[PDB]
Symmetry: C5
Subunit: 104 residues, 5 copies
């Protein structure tokens, strides 16, 4: 309903970003995943970790990106319910993630 | 309507994922968000298909994406919604290929 | 609404796919999601178009996507909603070219 | 709500497409889905622009897409909704360039 | 609601575009594409957006990385942002264009 900016940066020496919220309805809406200019020229895979419909945590790949092929990927508003961790699975980074934090 | 994370991995010795739901209180849809190749995938075509019914009850196979590490390692589908049951199948390539989405649940 | 899979394959020997549904009291809609190149597509530009009626009632042709195996083998359309009748046509390129999406049927 | 096909072709000899509607009862919206290069387009950057009024009433030009046949021959907009009137224009490149979407009438 | 065109141009010169109106109405920018103009140099450009998170802290988020020879346009799919927001060309020459909707 209300909407605010969200972002994070993943790199080899900080690979994880933990999205959680203190109880007060929230979604994280992912929009883009992009590589910074100094990312190495190799495939970077970013993954999300969160609850499936049977209440178990799963790890899913969100994007695979390479500077010389495909530096940005737009997700078009992929909504996830917190808690979620974003994780860098390969490549040096930096990788950036943008989106919205939604609050209803 | 509620929303839960969905993913599966397809590869050489595991080419299919069967998305099925039991009858519970709810209407279910699988919303596909991305298809992505993993970093160990061979530099060749990968084709990912969906298998489910058309509007006349016939089972059809439809091509979701053609991907290749050096050209286009990821495609974002934008929320391709599919009523269960559906099989997602690595029709061609070694993989690994990851498919991510949401499992949407509504009364 | 009900939601079903839609696909077609457009090729040299079958350039057109005609999307038409039997008379019924339901409203029908195609939501195009992807277009993609088959394995055996020549490395060249392939263009898929749609042919159907515009607001004025006139039959028009519109270019949906241009793809090439070594540049961009898949194009997501993100839910390009079209009201049947429509013909999808390989306008150039050898193919094969696949088109995927959803076929939506709502109640009256 | 009614949904019709929309498209236009922009090229060296026809650089502009002017979209306008006259309707005192129903609202119209042009929902742009893709921009794509034709098969004979020169392998160079192509820019496609729209021209239309902003919130303050000033007519403005915005860039919709930059495409190039050997790099990114199609750009998907996702349903970029525009209130008529609007001009679509090929700012630079040979073309031909195609714009496709939906004409929606409520 | 009402729906108007929006756009701006970002360049090494004027790196910034600034998007409240004092108004009785709610305003949203929906960002559609980010694209590199004809004379932009063949290098990595990064566009960022600056605005509050849901805690009202000012944050900066990477919207897109683009390069003429690899991905000259990124489509964001309607990334709705509530004003004030600054859009800025964190790196590269430009010109970089942003296009979208101003909804009221």
């Amino acid at each position: 309903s209300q909407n605010f900016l969200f972002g994070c940066e993943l790199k080899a020496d900080k690979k994880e970003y933990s999205f959680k919220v203190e109880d007060d309805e929230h979604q994280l809406s992912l929009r883009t995943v992009s590589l910074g200019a100094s990312a190495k020229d190799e495939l970077h895979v970013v993954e999300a970790e969160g609850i499936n419909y049977e209440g178990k945590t799963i790890k899913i790949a969100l994007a695979s990106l390479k500077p010389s092929v495909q530096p940005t990927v737009s997700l078009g508003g992929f909504e996830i319910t917190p808690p979620v961790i974003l994780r860098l699975k390969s490549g040096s980074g930096p990788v950036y993630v943008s989106g919205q934090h939604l609050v209803a």
